Design a protein around this motif. Structure first.
Motif, PDB file in Angstrom:
ATOM      1  N   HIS B  33       0.825  -1.205   0.000  1.00 53.88           N
ATOM      2  CA  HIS B  33       0.000   0.000   0.000  1.00 53.88           C
ATOM      3  C   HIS B  33       0.861   1.257   0.000  1.00 53.88           C
ATOM      4  N   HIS B  34       1.762   1.380   0.976  1.00 54.93           N
ATOM      5  CA  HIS B  34       2.568   2.593   1.073  1.00 54.93           C
ATOM      6  C   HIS B  34       3.482   2.749  -0.137  1.00 54.93           C
ATOM      7  N   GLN B  35       4.054   1.645  -0.626  1.00 59.25           N
ATOM      8  CA  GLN B  35       4.908   1.725  -1.809  1.00 59.25           C
ATOM      9  C   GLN B  35       4.127   2.231  -3.016  1.00 59.25           C
ATOM     10  N   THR B  36       2.863   1.824  -3.135  1.00 54.91           N
ATOM     11  CA  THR B  36       2.043   2.274  -4.254  1.00 54.91           C
ATOM     12  C   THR B  36       1.757   3.768  -4.157  1.00 54.91           C
ATOM     13  N   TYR B  37       1.566   4.279  -2.938  1.00 60.34           N
ATOM     14  CA  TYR B  37       1.388   5.716  -2.756  1.00 60.34           C
ATOM     15  C   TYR B  37       2.618   6.485  -3.223  1.00 60.34           C
ATOM     16  N   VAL B  38       3.809   5.997  -2.865  1.00 65.72           N
ATOM     17  CA  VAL B  38       5.050   6.679  -3.231  1.00 65.72           C
ATOM     18  C   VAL B  38       5.210   6.718  -4.746  1.00 65.72           C
ATOM     19  N   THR B  39       4.964   5.585  -5.405  1.00 63.32           N
ATOM     20  CA  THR B  39       5.100   5.517  -6.856  1.00 63.32           C
ATOM     21  C   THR B  39       4.118   6.458  -7.545  1.00 63.32           C
ATOM     22  N   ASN B  40       2.842   6.395  -7.160  1.00 61.31           N
ATOM     23  CA  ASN B  40       1.844   7.246  -7.799  1.00 61.31           C
ATOM     24  C   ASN B  40       2.043   8.714  -7.442  1.00 61.31           C
ATOM     25  N   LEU B  41       2.645   9.000  -6.285  1.00 64.55           N
ATOM     26  CA  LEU B  41       2.956  10.384  -5.937  1.00 64.55           C
ATOM     27  C   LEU B  41       4.052  10.951  -6.832  1.00 64.55           C
ATOM     28  N   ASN B  42       5.138  10.195  -7.021  1.00 64.41           N
ATOM     29  CA  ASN B  42       6.243  10.670  -7.848  1.00 64.41           C
ATOM     30  C   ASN B  42       5.803  10.927  -9.282  1.00 64.41           C
ATOM     31  N   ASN B  55       2.045  26.836 -17.524  1.00 62.27           N
ATOM     32  CA  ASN B  55       0.898  27.610 -17.042  1.00 62.27           C
ATOM     33  C   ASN B  55      -0.414  26.950 -17.457  1.00 62.27           C
ATOM     34  N   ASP B  56      -0.477  25.633 -17.280  1.00 63.27           N
ATOM     35  CA  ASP B  56      -1.639  24.825 -17.644  1.00 63.27           C
ATOM     36  C   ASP B  56      -2.444  24.580 -16.371  1.00 63.27           C
ATOM     37  N   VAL B  57      -3.342  25.512 -16.063  1.00 64.76           N
ATOM     38  CA  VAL B  57      -4.184  25.422 -14.869  1.00 64.76           C
ATOM     39  C   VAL B  57      -5.142  24.235 -14.967  1.00 64.76           C
ATOM     40  N   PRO B  58      -5.810  23.989 -16.108  1.00 66.32           N
ATOM     41  CA  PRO B  58      -6.678  22.798 -16.177  1.00 66.32           C
ATOM     42  C   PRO B  58      -5.960  21.492 -15.879  1.00 66.32           C
ATOM     43  N   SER B  59      -4.743  21.300 -16.394  1.00 63.76           N
ATOM     44  CA  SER B  59      -4.009  20.080 -16.074  1.00 63.76           C
ATOM     45  C   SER B  59      -3.577  20.066 -14.614  1.00 63.76           C
ATOM     46  N   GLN B  60      -3.220  21.231 -14.068  1.00 62.69           N
ATOM     47  CA  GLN B  60      -2.840  21.299 -12.661  1.00 62.69           C
ATOM     48  C   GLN B  60      -4.010  20.934 -11.756  1.00 62.69           C
ATOM     49  N   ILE B  61      -5.207  21.435 -12.072  1.00 61.15           N
ATOM     50  CA  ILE B  61      -6.381  21.126 -11.261  1.00 61.15           C
ATOM     51  C   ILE B  61      -6.717  19.642 -11.342  1.00 61.15           C
ATOM     52  N   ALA B  62      -6.595  19.050 -12.534  1.00 62.88           N
ATOM     53  CA  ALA B  62      -6.915  17.635 -12.698  1.00 62.88           C
ATOM     54  C   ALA B  62      -5.967  16.741 -11.909  1.00 62.88           C
ATOM     55  N   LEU B  63      -4.722  17.178 -11.712  1.00 60.53           N
ATOM     56  CA  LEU B  63      -3.737  16.376 -10.998  1.00 60.53           C
ATOM     57  C   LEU B  63      -3.823  16.529  -9.483  1.00 60.53           C
ATOM     58  N   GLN B  64      -4.671  17.431  -8.980  1.00 57.66           N
ATOM     59  CA  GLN B  64      -4.717  17.689  -7.543  1.00 57.66           C
ATOM     60  C   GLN B  64      -5.198  16.471  -6.760  1.00 57.66           C
ATOM     61  N   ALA B  65      -6.193  15.747  -7.282  1.00 56.12           N
ATOM     62  CA  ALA B  65      -6.710  14.589  -6.559  1.00 56.12           C
ATOM     63  C   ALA B  65      -5.622  13.542  -6.340  1.00 56.12           C
ATOM     64  N   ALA B  66      -4.804  13.289  -7.364  1.00 58.70           N
ATOM     65  CA  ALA B  66      -3.738  12.301  -7.233  1.00 58.70           C
ATOM     66  C   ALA B  66      -2.672  12.761  -6.247  1.00 58.70           C
ATOM     67  N   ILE B  67      -2.370  14.059  -6.229  1.00 57.74           N
ATOM     68  CA  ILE B  67      -1.335  14.561  -5.328  1.00 57.74           C
ATOM     69  C   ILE B  67      -1.836  14.571  -3.889  1.00 57.74           C
ATOM     70  N   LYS B  68      -3.086  14.986  -3.675  1.00 52.88           N
ATOM     71  CA  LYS B  68      -3.617  15.011  -2.316  1.00 52.88           C
ATOM     72  C   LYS B  68      -3.806  13.601  -1.770  1.00 52.88           C
ATOM     73  N   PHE B  69      -4.299  12.679  -2.598  1.00 54.61           N
ATOM     74  CA  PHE B  69      -4.525  11.319  -2.126  1.00 54.61           C
ATOM     75  C   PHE B  69      -3.207  10.595  -1.876  1.00 54.61           C
ATOM     76  N   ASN B  70      -2.332  10.550  -2.883  1.00 56.08           N
ATOM     77  CA  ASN B  70      -1.081   9.811  -2.736  1.00 56.08           C
ATOM     78  C   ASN B  70      -0.074  10.553  -1.866  1.00 56.08           C
ATOM     79  N   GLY B  71      -0.013  11.881  -1.974  1.00 57.19           N
ATOM     80  CA  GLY B  71       0.856  12.638  -1.089  1.00 57.19           C
ATOM     81  C   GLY B  71       0.375  12.619   0.349  1.00 57.19           C
ATOM     82  N   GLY B  72      -0.941  12.720   0.548  1.00 59.35           N
ATOM     83  CA  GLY B  72      -1.480  12.645   1.895  1.00 59.35           C
ATOM     84  C   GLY B  72      -1.257  11.290   2.537  1.00 59.35           C
ATOM     85  N   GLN B  73      -1.495  10.214   1.783  1.00 59.31           N
ATOM     86  CA  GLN B  73      -1.288   8.874   2.326  1.00 59.31           C
ATOM     87  C   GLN B  73       0.181   8.609   2.620  1.00 59.31           C
TER      88      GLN B  73
END
Ligand SMILES: [Mn+2]
Ligand SMILES: [Mn+2]
Ligand SMILES: [Mn+2]
Ligand SMILES: [Mn+2]
Lengths: 196, 197, 197, 197
Positions: B33-42, B55-73
Motif C-alpha cells: 500500500h505505502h509503496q504504491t502511494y510513493v510511486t503514484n505520488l512521484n 501555465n496549464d491550470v486545467p491540467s494542474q487542477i486535474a492532478l490535484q486529486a492524485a497529489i492530495k490522495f497519494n501525497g497525503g497517504q
C-alpha cells in the motif's frame, strides 16, 4: 422496520469470483449492521422530528444517509449477482440493455473497460454504477454509503469497499473487477433497464 | 529533484507489533500500500512540473486529486509507522509523554476518557479515513480526515490511527472496534510527546 | 406540530448597528433572507414528515440538504442577531466578557492577536460561509462553516460573523476586509460571555 | 510561472444594462476578477517553491487557492465572452445554429432549456455557477460550487454566475429576477464557437 434481505443463493455460489467467506461476512455482518443502525437512527429521528429538534435531526443525517444508502446499495448488489454457470450471467439475457450499451460505448467490452476505470478510480470507499438517466445510460460513482441520487435509476452496481474483496484479492482490486463480470446478473440488469 | 520520494523503512520488524497488528497486515500495508502511494505520488508530481511550467491550470487542477490522495497517504502512513512501537517497549508507556498526557487529562478528564472519545471518532468514520490527535496552539483536539487527506494546515498531528479497512480486515474482519481496542497497546507515546513538544 | 418555526425579532432597530452595518442590509438580511430560511425550513420539515410516515428512505435522503441548509441558517442567523449590539452599548465593550477575554488572551496572546487570526479565517472563506469563535470543552477555537451549515455538535458557538456576500456587499462592495474591521465595534461581548460561561 | 492577466471586456461597463448594472459590471470585472487573477498568480508562484522543495504538505495546502482562483479566472473569462449587449445580433439565439439545434433536440425547446437552467441556477446553495456543457455530442446542465471550473470531459458552452456579487447591488435577494433578465444578454455567437470548436 427494515430487514436484511435473504440471498438468492448460497454463500459459495459466486466462487471463484467472490469467496464464500467474503459473501458471508458481507451479507451477515456488514449489511446486517446497516439495517440495524438504520432502524436505530430512524427511531431517534422520529423523536427529534416531532419535538422540532433541528440540531438532533442534522446530527442524525449522516447515520440515515450512510446506513439507508448502504441498505439500498447492498440490496441491489445481491440481486445483480448470480452464479457464473447460470444463464442469467449471460449478457444475452439483456437484449435491450446490451443494445443500448453498444449504442453508448461502442461495445460491451468498451463499456466494461470504462466501468472498470471508474471503479478503480474511486479513492477510498464507494460504489460504481451503471444507471439510467432519462433515456440514456451513464456510469457514475457514489462515495462511502451514498445511494444513487434521485433522477438516476440504478441498473447494476459494484461494491468497491475494501471489505468486498480484501480477504480474497488483498490490495489487488483490479483482479476483483476483472473477475466480477462472470457473476453479473444480466437478467436483473435487463429487468431494471426496462422498468414498467 | 521533483518526485524523488521513497518508501521509508519501518522502525521495527514486520512482526514487532504483534499481537496487536499482525505481521501479514504490516507487510502488506507497508510494502504494497505505502509503496504504491510513493510511486503514484512521484509520477503525479513529475506530470505537475510540466503543467506548472506551461501555465496549464486545467491540467494542474486535474492532478490535484492524485497529489492530495497519494501525497497525503505518504504523509499519513509515514507518521503512522513512527507513532507505533512494540507493546513491550517503554515508548508504549504513556509515562513517556509527561507534557502530552498532562494536557490530555486537562482536556478530556483522563487518558481513558480521551481513549473513549478517540475511539468513538475512529469508529464513527464513514468509509475510509484516519483519526488524529492534533495540536492547535496549546490545546489538543481529536479530528478525522477522509480517504487519504492529510491534517489541514494549522493543526500539528500528534499521532494518527489508520481506519481504512485494509488496516485491520485480514486480522479483525469487520470488528473495527476490537482493532481500535488493541491498537492502544502499540501507540508510541515517546514519538507523540516529541511531536507535541 | 412539525415545522412551526418563526422569524425572531431583532433586539434593536434596523439602523441601530450603523455605521458598522447599514440599515438597508439589516432589514433585508432579517426580513427577507432569514424569513426565507424559516419558511423553507418549515416546508422541508413538513415534507419530511410525509416521507417518514411512508418509510421512504430515498425521499428522506433527498430532503437532508434542505433541512441542513435552512435549519442551519435559521440557527446561525438567530445567533448572529444576538451577538450584535450598538457600538455605544456597554455590551459592545470587551470588558463585558472578563472570563472570555481572559481565555482569548491565554489562547492567542491578546485580543488583537485573536482579531488578527479571526479576520484571516473570515477573509479566507472561499464562497459563502460563516466564521465562529467556538467553545470546545474548556478551550477556545476559531472555525468556519460553509454555506448554511451550523457549528457541529460538540463545539459551542460563542459568536459568529456572517461572511455571505449579502452580509456586507450593499455597504462595503467587494471590500470584505473593511466589513470585518468595522464589525468588531458591534460585537455583543455580553452575549458572547454568557455563551462562553 | 503565474503570469496571468485580467482580460479586457468586449464592451463598456454599462453595455449590459438594464440586465446587469454598470456598477456591478465594473466591480465584478475590475475588482472580483482582478483579485482572482492576482491570487492565482500568487498561489502558482508559491507552488513553484513547494514543488522544487518537495514540500507535499505545502503543495496540498495550496490546492484550494489554485483551484478556486484558477477556476474563477477560467469561469469569469468565459462569462464575459458569453455576454453581449441586448441590441447586438449576438444576443439573438439564431447566431448559434449548431448549438441551438442540439438544445431543442435535448430539452425540446429553448424555453424548456431556460426553465431547466433557471431551476438549476436557483437551486445552488451558496456561491456557484450554472453551465450548459457539451459532453461528447450531447448537452447537459451542470452546476459548479464556489470557484470550481467545469469538470474535464464537459466543454462549457456558456455559464451564468450565481455568486451574490453578480446581482445583489441591483436585484438584492431577488436572484430569480436576475436569472430572468440575464437571458437578454447571452452571447450565442461565443456559445456557438465553443460548441463547435
Ligand atoms: Mn459493502
Ligand atoms: Mn493505510
Ligand atoms: Mn446571512
Ligand atoms: Mn463572479
Amino acid at each position: 422496520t427494515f430487514s436484511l434481505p435473504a440471498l438468492p443463493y448460497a454463500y459459495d455460489a459466486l466462487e471463484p469470483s467472490i469467496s464464500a467467506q467474503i459473501m458471508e461476512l458481507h451479507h451477515s455482518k456488514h449489511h446486517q449492521t446497516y439495517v440495524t443502525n438504520l432502524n436505530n437512527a430512524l427511531k431517534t429521528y422520529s423523536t427529534a422530528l416531532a419535538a422540532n429538534d433541528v440540531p438532533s435531526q442534522i446530527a442524525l443525517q449522516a447515520a440515515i444517509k450512510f446506513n439507508g444508502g448502504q441498505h439500498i446499495n447492498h440490496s441491489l448488489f445481491w440481486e445483480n449477482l448470480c452464479p457464473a454457470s447460470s444463464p442469467d450471467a449471460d449478457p444475452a439475457s439483456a437484449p435491450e440493455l446490451t443494445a443500448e450499451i453498444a449504442k453508448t460505448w461502442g461495445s460491451l467490452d468498451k463499456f466494461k473497460e470504462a466501468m472498470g476505470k471508474a471503479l478503480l478510480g474511486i479513492q477510498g470507499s464507494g460504489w460504481g454504477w451503471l444507471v439510467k438517466e432519462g433515456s440514456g445510460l451513464r456510469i457514475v460513482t457514489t462515495k462511502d454509503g451514498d445511494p444513487v441520487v434521485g433522477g438516476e435509476v440504478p441498473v447494476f452496481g459494484i461494491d468497491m469497499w475494501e471489505h468486498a474483496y480484501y480477504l480474497q484479492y488483498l490490495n489487488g482490486k483490479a483482479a476483483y473487477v476483472d473477475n466480477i463480470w462472470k457473476v453479473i446478473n444480466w437478467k436483473t440488469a435487463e429487468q431494471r433497464f426496462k422498468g414498467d
